[PDB]
Amino acid sequence: QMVRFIRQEAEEKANEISVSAEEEFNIEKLQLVEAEKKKIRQEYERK
Amino acid sequence: ASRYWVVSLPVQNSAASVWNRLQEQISKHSFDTPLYRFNIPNLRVGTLDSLLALSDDLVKSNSFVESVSHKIRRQIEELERVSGIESSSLSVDGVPVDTYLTRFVWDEAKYPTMSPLREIVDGIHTLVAKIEDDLKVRVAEYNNVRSQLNAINRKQSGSLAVRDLSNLVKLVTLLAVVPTSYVVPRSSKLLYEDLYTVTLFGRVADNFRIAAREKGFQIRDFEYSSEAQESRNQELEKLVHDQESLRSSLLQWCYTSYGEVFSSWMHFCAVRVFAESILRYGLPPSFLACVLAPSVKGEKKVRSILEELCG
């Protein structure tokens, strides 16, 4: 009966991994969307 | 084997009917004594001090000969496959015991130098020591082979405390429990019989633990793959075969070295003939004694004959 439960456990592990990846995805996106007001002070403000 | 059994009598102290009768036509024929000898003097002999030094070193020479004899009789025979070298195969100085003891031809240039034997005796002793060292090397090789023998095959034949992978069934583990229903697919039966297998499954540890060690008698773990056990058994068989071959082929070389040691002992007896001649007669080597392995009655008769030079 736990043969099908193995699939459920694998699905739960994959869902947890995907949830962690998505949670870090917002931070990764904000790492570039934000703080570029500082990097533009060197990329173009130097000009 | 047999220790030294040579008689002591110079040329001037022959115990036979005549001085030259020691070799043949002696009264020993009537008593069936196997005594026989043949002269083989060296080129020259040392002085009185040299004779005394040789007599002193004769004790060490006899000790070395005894050590070689003990090694040859023990290492070869104990292997139960090296004692195949008979008297002819182990002939001393190229002649069997019938002829080796009847002559001193071993005094040729092989072990000694066919020269004043004061240092030639030491040289022959060193050669015999080298031969004994080779025999000891062969014995050590035989011991290492026996260490290779009694290998992993000495363990149990599977489904037991040791080497149980040979009887493995190859979520499950090698249990072989010698004298279950749950969510897990416990409806199974492994091939772990050399023993018995029980219903178990890795999906839920309840059935697996119950079958393995939970109740009754705990099972014995073993390697999962029987290929490793088969390889270990094959290696053990190969090591046993190699040990047997060494006891039959390398120990055949050991038996050849034992025959060489017998030749060295014949040379030592030839030297001891001249040593006794110097001790109880003049310096030049000349002896009329004999070397054999007679019975008690024959030795007593020889002593009665030679009582003119008793100790």
Which residues in chain A have their CB less than 8 angstroms from residue B201's CB? 2
Which residues in chain A have their CB less than 8 angstroms from residue B184's CB? 1-2
User: Do residues B281 and B91 make contact, with C-beta atoms less than 8 angstroms apart?
Assistant: no
Q: Is B204 on the interface with A (CB under 8 A)?
A: yes
Amino acid at B7: V
Partners of B92 in the β-ladder:
B95
User: Do residues B41 and B283 make contact, with C-beta atoms less than 8 angstroms apart?
Assistant: no
Q: What b/e string do you get for B256-295 counting C-beta neighbours within 10 Å, with b at 16 or more?
A: bbbbbbbbbbbbbbbbbbbbbbbebbeeebbbbbbbbebe
3-state secondary structure of B181: coil
Angstrom distance (rounded) from CA B40 to CA B274? 9
Deposited experimental method: cryo-EM
CA B150 to chain A, closest CA, distance in angstroms equals: 46
Which residues in chain A have their CB less than 8 angstroms from residue B204's CB? 2
Interface test with A, best of B171, B183, B188, B208 (most A CBs within 10 A): B183
B115 CB neighbour count, 10 Å cutoff = 13
Nearest residue of chain A to residue B181 (CA atoms) = A1
Nearest residue of chain B to residue A6 (CA atoms) = B203
- CA-based radius of gyration for chain A: 20
- Counted residue by residue, chain A has a size of 47
Which residues in chain B have their CB less than 8 angstroms from residue A7's CB? none
Task: Tokens for B44, please give them.
Answer: 């020259």
Amino acid at B277: S
First to last CA, chain A: 69
CA B185 to chain A, closest CA, distance in angstroms equals: 7
User: Taking CB atoms and an 8 Å limit, are A6 and B184 in contact across chains?
Assistant: no
Q: Is A4 on the interface with B (CB under 8 A)?
A: no
Which residues in chain B have their CB less than 8 angstroms from residue A5's CB? 183, 203
Q: Is A5 on the interface with B (CB under 8 A)?
A: yes
C-alpha closest to that of B234 among B147, B166, B143: B166
Tell me the CA distances in angstroms from B21 to B24, B68, B92, B285, B287, one per residue in order. 5, 33, 24, 18, 12
Cα torsion through B4, B8, B11, B14, rounded to 10: -110
